[PDB]
PDB file of C-alpha atoms and ligand atoms in Angstrom:
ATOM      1  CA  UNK I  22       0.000   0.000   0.000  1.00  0.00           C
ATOM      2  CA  UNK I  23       1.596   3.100  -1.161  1.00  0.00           C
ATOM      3  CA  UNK I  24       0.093   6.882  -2.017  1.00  0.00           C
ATOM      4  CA  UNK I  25       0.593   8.591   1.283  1.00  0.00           C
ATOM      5  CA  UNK I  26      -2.887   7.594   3.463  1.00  0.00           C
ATOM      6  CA  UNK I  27      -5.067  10.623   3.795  1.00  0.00           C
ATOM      7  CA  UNK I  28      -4.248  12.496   7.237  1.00  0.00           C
ATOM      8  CA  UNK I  29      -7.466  13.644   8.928  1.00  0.00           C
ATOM      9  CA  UNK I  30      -6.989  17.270   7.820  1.00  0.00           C
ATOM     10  CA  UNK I  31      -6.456  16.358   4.188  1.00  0.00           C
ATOM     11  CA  UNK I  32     -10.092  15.069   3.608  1.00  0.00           C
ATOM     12  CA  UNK I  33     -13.462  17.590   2.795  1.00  0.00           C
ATOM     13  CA  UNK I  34     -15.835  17.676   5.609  1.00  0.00           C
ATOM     14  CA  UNK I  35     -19.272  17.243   4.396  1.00  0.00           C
ATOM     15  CA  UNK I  36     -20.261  20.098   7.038  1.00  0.00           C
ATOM     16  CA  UNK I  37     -18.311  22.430   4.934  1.00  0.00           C
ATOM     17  CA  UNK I  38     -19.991  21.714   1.858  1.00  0.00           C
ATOM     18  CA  UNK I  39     -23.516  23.878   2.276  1.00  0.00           C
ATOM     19  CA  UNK I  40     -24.899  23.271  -1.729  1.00  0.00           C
ATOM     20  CA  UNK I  41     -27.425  20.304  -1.869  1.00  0.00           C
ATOM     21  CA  UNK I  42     -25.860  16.775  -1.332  1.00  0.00           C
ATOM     22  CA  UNK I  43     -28.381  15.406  -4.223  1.00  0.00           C
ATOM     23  CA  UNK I  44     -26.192  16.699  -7.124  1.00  0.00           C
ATOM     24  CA  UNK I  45     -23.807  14.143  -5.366  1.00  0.00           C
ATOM     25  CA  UNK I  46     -26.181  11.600  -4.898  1.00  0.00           C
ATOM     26  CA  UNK I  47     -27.159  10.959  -8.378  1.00  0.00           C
ATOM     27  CA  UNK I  48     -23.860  10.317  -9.694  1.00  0.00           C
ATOM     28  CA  UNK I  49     -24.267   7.007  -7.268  1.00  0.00           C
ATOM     29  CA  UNK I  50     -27.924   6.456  -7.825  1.00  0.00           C
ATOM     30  CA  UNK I  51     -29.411   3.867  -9.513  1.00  0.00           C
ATOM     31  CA  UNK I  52     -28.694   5.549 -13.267  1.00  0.00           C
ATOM     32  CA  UNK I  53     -25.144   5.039 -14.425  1.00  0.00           C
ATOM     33  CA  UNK I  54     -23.428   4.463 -18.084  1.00  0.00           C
ATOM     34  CA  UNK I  55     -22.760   0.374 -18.866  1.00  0.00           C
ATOM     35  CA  UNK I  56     -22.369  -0.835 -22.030  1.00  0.00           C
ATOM     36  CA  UNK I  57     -20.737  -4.620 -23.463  1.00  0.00           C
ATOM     37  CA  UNK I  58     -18.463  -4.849 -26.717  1.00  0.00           C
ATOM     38  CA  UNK I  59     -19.316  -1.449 -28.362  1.00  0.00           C
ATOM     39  CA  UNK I  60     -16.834   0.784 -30.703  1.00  0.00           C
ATOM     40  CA  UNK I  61     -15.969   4.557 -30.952  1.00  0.00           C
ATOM     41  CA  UNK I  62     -18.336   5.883 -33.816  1.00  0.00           C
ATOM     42  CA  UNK I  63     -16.804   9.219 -33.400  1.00  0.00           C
ATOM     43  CA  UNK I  64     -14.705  11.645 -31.759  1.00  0.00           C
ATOM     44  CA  UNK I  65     -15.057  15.159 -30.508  1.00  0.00           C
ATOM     45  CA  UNK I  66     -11.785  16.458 -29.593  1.00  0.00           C
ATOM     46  CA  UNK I  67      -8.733  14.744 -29.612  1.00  0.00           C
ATOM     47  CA  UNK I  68      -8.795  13.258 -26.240  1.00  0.00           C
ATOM     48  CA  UNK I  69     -12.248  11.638 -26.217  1.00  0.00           C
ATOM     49  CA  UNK I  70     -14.418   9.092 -28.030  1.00  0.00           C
ATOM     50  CA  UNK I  71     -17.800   9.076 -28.942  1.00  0.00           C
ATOM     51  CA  UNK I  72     -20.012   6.123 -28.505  1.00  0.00           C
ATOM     52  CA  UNK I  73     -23.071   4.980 -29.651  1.00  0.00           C
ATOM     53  CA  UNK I  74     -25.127   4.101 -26.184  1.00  0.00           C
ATOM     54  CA  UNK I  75     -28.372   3.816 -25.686  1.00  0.00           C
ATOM     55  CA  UNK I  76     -30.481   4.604 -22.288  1.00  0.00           C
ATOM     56  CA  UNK I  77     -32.181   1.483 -22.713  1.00  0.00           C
ATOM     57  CA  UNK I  78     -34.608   2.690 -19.505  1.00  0.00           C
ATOM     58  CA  UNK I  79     -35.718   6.492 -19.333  1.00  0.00           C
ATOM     59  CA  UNK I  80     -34.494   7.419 -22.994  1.00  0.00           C
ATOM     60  CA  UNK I  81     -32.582   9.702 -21.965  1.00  0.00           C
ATOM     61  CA  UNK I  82     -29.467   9.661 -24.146  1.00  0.00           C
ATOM     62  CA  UNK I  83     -28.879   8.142 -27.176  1.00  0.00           C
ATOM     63  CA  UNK I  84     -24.666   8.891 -27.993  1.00  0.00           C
ATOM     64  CA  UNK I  85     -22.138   8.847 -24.821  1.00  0.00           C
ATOM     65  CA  UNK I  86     -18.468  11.173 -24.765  1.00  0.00           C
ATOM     66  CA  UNK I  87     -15.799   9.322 -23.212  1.00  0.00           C
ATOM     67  CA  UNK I  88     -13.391  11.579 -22.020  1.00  0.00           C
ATOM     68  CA  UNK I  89      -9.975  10.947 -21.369  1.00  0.00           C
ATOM     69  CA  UNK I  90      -6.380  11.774 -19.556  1.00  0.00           C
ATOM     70  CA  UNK I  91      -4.521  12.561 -22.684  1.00  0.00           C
ATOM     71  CA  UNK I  92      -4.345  11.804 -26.497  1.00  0.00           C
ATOM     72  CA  UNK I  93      -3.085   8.243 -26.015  1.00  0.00           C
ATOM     73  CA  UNK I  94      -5.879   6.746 -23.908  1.00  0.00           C
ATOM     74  CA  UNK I  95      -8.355   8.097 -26.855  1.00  0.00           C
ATOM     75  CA  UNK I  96      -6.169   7.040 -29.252  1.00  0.00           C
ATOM     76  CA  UNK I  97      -5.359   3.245 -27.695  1.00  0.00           C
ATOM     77  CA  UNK I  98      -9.321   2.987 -28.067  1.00  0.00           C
ATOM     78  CA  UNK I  99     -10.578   4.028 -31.034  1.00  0.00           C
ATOM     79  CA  UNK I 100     -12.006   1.812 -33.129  1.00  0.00           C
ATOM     80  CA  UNK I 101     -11.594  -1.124 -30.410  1.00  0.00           C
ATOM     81  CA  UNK I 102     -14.766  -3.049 -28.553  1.00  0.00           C
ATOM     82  CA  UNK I 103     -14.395  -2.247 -25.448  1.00  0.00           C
ATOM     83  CA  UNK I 104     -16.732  -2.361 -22.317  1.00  0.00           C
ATOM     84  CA  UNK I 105     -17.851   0.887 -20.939  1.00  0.00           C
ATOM     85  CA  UNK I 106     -19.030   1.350 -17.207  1.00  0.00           C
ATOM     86  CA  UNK I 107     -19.317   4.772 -15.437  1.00  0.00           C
ATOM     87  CA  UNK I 108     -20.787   7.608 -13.864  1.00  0.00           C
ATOM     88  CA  UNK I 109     -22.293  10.284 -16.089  1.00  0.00           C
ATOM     89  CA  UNK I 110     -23.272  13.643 -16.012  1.00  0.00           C
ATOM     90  CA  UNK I 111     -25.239  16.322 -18.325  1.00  0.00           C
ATOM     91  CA  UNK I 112     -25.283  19.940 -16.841  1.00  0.00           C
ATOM     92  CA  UNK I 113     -22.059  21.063 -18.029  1.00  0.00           C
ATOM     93  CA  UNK I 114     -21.700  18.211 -20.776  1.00  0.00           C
ATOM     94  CA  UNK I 115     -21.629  19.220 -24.515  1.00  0.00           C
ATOM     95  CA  UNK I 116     -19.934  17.860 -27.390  1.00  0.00           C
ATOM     96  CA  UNK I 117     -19.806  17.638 -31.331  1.00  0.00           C
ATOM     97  CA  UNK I 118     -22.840  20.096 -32.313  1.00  0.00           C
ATOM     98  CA  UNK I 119     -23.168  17.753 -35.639  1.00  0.00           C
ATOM     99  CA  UNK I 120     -20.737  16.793 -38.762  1.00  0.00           C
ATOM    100  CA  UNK I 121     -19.288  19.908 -39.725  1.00  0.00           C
ATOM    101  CA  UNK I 122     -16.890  20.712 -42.626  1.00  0.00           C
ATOM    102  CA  UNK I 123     -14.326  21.905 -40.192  1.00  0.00           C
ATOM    103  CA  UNK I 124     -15.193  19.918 -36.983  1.00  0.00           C
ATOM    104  CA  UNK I 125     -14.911  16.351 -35.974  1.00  0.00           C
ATOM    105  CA  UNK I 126     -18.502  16.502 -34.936  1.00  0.00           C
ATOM    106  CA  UNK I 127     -21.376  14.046 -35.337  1.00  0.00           C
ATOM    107  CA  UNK I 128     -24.476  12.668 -32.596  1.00  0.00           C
ATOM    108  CA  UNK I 129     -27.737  13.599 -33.473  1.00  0.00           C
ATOM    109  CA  UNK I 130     -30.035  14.298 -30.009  1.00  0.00           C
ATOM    110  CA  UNK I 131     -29.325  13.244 -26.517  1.00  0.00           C
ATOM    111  CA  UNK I 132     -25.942  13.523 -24.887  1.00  0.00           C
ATOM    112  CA  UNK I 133     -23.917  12.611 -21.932  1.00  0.00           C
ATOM    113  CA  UNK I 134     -21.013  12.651 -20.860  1.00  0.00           C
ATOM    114  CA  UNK I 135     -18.359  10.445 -18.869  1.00  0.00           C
ATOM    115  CA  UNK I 136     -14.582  10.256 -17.855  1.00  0.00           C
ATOM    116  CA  UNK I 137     -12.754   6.929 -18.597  1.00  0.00           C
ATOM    117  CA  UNK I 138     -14.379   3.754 -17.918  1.00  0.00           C
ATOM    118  CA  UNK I 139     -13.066   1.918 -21.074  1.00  0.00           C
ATOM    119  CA  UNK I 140     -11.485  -1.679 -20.904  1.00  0.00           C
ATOM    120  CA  UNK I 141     -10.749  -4.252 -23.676  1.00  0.00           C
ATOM    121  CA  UNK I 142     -14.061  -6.272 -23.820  1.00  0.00           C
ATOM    122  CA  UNK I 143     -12.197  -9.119 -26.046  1.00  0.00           C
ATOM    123  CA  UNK I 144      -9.897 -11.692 -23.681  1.00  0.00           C
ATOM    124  CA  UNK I 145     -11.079  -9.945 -20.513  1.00  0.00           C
ATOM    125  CA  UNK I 146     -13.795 -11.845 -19.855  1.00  0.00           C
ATOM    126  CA  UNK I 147     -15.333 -14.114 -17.226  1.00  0.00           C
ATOM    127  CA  UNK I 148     -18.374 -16.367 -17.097  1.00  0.00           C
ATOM    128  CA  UNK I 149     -18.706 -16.431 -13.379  1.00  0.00           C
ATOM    129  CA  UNK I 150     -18.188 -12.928 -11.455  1.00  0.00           C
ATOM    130  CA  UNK I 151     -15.491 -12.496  -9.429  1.00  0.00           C
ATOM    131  CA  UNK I 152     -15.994 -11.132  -6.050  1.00  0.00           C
ATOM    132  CA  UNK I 153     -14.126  -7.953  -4.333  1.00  0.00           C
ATOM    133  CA  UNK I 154     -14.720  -7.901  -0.809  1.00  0.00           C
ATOM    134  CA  UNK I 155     -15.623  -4.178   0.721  1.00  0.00           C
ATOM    135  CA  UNK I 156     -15.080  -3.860   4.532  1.00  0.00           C
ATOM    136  CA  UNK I 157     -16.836  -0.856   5.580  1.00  0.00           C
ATOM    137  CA  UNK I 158     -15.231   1.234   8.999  1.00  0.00           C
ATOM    138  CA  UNK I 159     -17.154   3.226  11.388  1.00  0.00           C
ATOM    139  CA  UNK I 160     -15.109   5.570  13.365  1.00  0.00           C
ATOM    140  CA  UNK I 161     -12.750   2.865  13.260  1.00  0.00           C
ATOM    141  CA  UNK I 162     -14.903   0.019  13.483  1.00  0.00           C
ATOM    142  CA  UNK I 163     -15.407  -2.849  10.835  1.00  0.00           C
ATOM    143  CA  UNK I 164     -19.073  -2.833  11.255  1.00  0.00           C
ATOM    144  CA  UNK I 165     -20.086  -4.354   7.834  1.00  0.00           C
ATOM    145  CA  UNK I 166     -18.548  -5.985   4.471  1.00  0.00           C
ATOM    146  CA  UNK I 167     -20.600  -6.721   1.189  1.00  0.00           C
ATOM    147  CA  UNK I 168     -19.821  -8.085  -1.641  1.00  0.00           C
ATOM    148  CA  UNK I 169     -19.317  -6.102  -5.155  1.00  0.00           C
ATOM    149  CA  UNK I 170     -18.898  -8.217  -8.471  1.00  0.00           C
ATOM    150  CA  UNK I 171     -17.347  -8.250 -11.704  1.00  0.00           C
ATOM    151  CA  UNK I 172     -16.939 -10.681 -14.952  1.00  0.00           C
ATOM    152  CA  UNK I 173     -13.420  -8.852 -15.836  1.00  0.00           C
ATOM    153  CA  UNK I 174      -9.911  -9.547 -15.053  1.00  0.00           C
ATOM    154  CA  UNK I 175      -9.435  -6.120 -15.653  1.00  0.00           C
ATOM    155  CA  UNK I 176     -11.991  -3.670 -13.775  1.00  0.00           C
ATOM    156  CA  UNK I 177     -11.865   0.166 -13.377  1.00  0.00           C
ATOM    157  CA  UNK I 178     -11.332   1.603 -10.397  1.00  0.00           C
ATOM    158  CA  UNK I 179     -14.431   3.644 -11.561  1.00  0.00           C
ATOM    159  CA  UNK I 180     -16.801   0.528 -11.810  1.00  0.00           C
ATOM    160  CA  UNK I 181     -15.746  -0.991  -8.249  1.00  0.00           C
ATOM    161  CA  UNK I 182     -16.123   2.678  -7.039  1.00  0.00           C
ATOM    162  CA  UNK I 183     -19.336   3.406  -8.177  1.00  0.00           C
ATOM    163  CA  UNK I 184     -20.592  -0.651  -7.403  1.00  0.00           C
ATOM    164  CA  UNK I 185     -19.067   0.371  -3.688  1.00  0.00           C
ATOM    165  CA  UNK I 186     -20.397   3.810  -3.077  1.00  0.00           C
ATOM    166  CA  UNK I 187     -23.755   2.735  -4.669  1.00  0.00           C
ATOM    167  CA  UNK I 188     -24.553   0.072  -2.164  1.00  0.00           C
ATOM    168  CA  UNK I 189     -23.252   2.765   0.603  1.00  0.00           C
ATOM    169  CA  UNK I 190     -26.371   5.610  -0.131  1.00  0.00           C
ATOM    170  CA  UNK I 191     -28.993   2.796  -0.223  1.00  0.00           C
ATOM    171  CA  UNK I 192     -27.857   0.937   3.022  1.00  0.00           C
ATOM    172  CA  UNK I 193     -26.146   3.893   4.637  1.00  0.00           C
ATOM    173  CA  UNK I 194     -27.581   7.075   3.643  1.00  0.00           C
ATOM    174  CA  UNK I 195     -23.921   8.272   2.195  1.00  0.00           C
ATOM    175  CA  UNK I 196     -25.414  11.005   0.168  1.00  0.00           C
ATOM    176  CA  UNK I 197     -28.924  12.446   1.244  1.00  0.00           C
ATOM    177  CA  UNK I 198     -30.727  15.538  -0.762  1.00  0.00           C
ATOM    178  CA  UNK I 199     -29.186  17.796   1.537  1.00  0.00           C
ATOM    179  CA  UNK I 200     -27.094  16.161   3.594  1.00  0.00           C
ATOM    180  CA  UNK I 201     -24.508  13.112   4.911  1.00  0.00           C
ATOM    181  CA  UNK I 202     -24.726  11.777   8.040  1.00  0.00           C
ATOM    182  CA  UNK I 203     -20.850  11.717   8.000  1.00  0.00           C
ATOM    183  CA  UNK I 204     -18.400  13.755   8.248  1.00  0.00           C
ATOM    184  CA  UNK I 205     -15.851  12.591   5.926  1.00  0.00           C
ATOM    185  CA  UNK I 206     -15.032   9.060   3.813  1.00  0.00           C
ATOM    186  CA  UNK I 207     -12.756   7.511   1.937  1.00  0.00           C
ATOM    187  CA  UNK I 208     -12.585   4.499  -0.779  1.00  0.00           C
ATOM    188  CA  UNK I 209      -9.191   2.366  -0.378  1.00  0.00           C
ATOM    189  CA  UNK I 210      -8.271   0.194  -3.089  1.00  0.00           C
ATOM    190  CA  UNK I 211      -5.483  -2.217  -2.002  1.00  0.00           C
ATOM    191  CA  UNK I 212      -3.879  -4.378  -4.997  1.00  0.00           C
ATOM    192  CA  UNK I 213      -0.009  -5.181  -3.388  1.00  0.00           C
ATOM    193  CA  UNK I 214       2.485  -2.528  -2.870  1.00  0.00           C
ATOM    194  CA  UNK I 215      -0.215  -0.218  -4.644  1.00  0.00           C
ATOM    195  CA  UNK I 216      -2.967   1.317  -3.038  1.00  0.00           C
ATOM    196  CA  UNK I 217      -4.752   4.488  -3.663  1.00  0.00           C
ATOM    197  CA  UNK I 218      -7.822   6.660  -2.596  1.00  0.00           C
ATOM    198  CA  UNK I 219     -10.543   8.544  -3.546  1.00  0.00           C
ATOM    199  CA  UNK I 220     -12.454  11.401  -1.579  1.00  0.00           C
ATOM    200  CA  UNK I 221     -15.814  10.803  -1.106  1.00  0.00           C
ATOM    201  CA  UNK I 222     -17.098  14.337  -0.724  1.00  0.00           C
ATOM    202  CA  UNK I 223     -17.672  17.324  -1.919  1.00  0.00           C
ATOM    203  CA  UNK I 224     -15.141  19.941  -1.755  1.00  0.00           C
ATOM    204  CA  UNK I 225     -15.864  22.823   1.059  1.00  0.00           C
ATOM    205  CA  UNK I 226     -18.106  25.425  -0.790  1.00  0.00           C
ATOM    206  CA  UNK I 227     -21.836  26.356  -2.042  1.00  0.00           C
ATOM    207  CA  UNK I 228     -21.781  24.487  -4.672  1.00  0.00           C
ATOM    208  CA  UNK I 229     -20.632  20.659  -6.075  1.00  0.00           C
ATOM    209  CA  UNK I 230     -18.968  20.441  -9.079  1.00  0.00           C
ATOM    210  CA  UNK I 231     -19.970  17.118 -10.949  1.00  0.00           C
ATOM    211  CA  UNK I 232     -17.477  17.360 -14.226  1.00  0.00           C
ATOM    212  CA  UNK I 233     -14.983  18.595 -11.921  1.00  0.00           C
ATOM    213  CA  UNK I 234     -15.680  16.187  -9.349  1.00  0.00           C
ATOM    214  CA  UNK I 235     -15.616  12.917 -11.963  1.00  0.00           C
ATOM    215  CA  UNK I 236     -12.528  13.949 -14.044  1.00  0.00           C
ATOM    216  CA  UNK I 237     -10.623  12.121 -11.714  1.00  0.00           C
ATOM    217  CA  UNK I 238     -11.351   8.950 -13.525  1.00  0.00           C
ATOM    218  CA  UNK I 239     -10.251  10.324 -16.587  1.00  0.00           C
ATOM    219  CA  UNK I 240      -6.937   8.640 -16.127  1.00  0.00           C
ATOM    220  CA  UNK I 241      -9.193   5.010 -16.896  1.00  0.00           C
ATOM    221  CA  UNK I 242      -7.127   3.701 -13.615  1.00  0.00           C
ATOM    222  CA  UNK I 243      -7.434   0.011 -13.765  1.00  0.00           C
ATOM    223  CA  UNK I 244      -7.223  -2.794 -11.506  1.00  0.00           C
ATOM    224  CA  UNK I 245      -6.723  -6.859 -11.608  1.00  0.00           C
ATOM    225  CA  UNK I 246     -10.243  -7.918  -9.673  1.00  0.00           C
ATOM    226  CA  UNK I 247      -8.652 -10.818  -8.799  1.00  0.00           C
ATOM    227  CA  UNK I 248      -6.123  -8.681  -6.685  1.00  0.00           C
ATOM    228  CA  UNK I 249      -7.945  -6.081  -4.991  1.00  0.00           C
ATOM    229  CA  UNK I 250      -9.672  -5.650  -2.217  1.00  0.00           C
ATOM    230  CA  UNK I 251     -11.731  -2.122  -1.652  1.00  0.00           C
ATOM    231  CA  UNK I 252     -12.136  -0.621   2.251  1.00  0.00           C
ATOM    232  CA  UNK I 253     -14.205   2.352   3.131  1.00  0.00           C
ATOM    233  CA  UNK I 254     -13.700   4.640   5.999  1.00  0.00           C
ATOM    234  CA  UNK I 255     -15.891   6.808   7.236  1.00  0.00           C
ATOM    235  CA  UNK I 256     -16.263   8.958  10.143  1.00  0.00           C
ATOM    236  CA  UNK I 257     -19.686  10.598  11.805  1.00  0.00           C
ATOM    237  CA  UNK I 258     -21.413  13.803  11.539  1.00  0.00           C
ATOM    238  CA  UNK I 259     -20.929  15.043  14.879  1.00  0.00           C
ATOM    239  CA  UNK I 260     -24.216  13.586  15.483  1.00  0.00           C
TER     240      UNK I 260
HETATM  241  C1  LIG L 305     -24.676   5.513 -33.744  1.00  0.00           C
HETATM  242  C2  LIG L 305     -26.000   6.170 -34.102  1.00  0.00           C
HETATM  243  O1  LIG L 305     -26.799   5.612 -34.882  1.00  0.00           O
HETATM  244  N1  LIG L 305     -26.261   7.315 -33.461  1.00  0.00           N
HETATM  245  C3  LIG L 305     -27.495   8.047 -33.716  1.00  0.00           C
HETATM  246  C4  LIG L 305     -28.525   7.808 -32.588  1.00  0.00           C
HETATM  247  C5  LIG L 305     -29.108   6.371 -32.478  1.00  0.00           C
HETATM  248  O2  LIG L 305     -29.698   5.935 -33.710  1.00  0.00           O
HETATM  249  C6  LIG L 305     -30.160   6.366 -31.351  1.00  0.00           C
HETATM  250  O3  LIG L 305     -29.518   6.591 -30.093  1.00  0.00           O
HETATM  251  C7  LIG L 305     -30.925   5.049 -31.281  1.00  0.00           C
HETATM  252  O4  LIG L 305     -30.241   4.167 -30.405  1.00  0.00           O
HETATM  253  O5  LIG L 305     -29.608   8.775 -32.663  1.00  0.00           O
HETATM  254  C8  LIG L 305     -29.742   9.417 -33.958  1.00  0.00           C
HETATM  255  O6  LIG L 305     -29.898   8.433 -34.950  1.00  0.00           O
HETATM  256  C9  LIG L 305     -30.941   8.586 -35.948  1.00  0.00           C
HETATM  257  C10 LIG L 305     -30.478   9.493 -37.115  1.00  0.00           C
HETATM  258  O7  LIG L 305     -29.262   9.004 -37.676  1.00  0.00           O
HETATM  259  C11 LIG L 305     -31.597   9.549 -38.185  1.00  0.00           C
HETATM  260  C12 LIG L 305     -31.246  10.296 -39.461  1.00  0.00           C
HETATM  261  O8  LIG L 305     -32.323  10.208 -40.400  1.00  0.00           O
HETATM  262  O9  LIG L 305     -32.005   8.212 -38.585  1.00  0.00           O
HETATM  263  C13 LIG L 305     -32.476   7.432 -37.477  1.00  0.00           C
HETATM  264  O10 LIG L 305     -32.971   6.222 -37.953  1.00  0.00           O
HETATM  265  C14 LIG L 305     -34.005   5.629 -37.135  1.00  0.00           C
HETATM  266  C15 LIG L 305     -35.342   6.327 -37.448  1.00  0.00           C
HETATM  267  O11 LIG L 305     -35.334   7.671 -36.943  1.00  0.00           O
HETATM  268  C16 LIG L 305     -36.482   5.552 -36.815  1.00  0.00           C
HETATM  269  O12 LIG L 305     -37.728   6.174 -37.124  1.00  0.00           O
HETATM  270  C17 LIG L 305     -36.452   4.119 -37.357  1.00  0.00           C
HETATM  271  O13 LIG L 305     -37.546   3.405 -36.871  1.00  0.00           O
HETATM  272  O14 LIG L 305     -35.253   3.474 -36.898  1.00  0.00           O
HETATM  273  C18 LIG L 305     -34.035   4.095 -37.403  1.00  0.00           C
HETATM  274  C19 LIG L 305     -32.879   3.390 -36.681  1.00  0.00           C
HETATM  275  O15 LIG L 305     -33.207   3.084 -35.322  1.00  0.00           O
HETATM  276  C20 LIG L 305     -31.326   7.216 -36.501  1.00  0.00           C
HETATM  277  O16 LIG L 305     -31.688   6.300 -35.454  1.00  0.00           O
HETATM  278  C21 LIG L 305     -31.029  10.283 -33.884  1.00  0.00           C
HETATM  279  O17 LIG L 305     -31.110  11.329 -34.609  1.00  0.00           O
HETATM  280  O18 LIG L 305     -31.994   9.879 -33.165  1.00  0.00           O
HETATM  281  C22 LIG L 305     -28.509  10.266 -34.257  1.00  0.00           C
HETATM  282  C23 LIG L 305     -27.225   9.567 -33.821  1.00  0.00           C
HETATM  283  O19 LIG L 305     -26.185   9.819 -34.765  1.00  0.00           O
END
């Protein structure tokens, strides 16, 4: 385990963030991007791909925009089936306007957008799911694990993230409309020497920035499921 483990002053306090929790919420709601052995149709700029995926529930968008770290991530996945699986967002998400004779442009109605969440869908698969334990702390106390599952060797820490932090606001009320009955939180993903963290909330302020916020998958970080092993630590609202 090795990126420096966040010191108790390093994480956001939920108390400090005073701009409805919801726009947090939703990100780990029951919506989310997932898509099996699809191909870039387009691109917009030269960091991102452009898929053809279909809200196959509320409608709701019909093309996808992948976004990515750099120009070699978007370029290492064009024209490849992949997998996608991620969380998605729409208020500040805009892309191609349609096939100009100047811009790379294309998708006619609906959009959404996403960072990373791309893996090979060819060799990387698995009839029978594999299953990362998550073990849960309390102030300290291991006071639940659940299980979060996956038919790839090779799993984003984006999907395990999202599969963790979903169960979390159903069971535990992570993210309410206005609130979080904790004070801060943090996802752990342990592989070997590696290990690395993500902040579960919002950054002190009126307001939550959801591109902002989810760019920090944009780097399409993945892991071996067979390897990890996710924990989640999270401390209480001063109750
Ligand atoms: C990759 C791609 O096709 N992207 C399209 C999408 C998808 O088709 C949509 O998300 C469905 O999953 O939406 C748009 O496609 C339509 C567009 O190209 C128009 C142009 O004339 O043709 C449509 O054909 C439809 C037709 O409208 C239906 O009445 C018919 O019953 O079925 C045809 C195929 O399903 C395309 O679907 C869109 O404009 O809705 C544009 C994106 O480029």
């Amino acid at each position: 385990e090795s990126q420096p483990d966040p010191k108790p002053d390093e994480l956001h306090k939920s108390s400090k963030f005073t701009g409805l929790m919801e726009n947090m919420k939703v990100l780990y709601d029951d919506n989310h991007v997932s898509a099996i052995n699809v191909k870039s149709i387009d691109q917009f700029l030269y960091f991102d791909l452009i898929y053809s995926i279909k809200d196959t529930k509320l409608g709701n968008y019909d093309n996808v925009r992948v976004e990515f770290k750099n120009k070699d991530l978007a370029d290492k996945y064009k024209d490849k089936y992949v997998d996608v699986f991620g969380a998605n967002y729409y208020y500040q998400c805009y892309f191609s306007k349609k096939t100009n004779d100047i811009n790379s442009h294309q998708t006619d109605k609906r959009k959404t957008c996403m960072y990373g969440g791309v893996t090979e869908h060819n060799g990387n698969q698995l009839d029978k799911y594999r299953s990362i334990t998550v073990r849960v702390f309390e102030d300290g106390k291991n006071l639940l694990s659940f299980d979060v599952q996956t038919n790839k060797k090779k799993v984003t820490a984006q999907e395990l993230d999202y599969l963790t932090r979903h169960y979390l606001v159903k069971n535990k009320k992570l993210y309410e409309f206005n609130n979080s009955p904790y004070e801060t939180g943090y996802i752990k993903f342990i592989e070997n020497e590696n290990s690395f963290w993500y902040d579960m909330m919002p950054a002190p302020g009126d307001k939550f920035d959801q591109s902002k916020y989810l760019m920090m998958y944009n780097d399409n970080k993945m892991v071996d499921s067979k390897d990890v092993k996710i924990e989640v630590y999270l401390t209480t609202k001063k109750k």
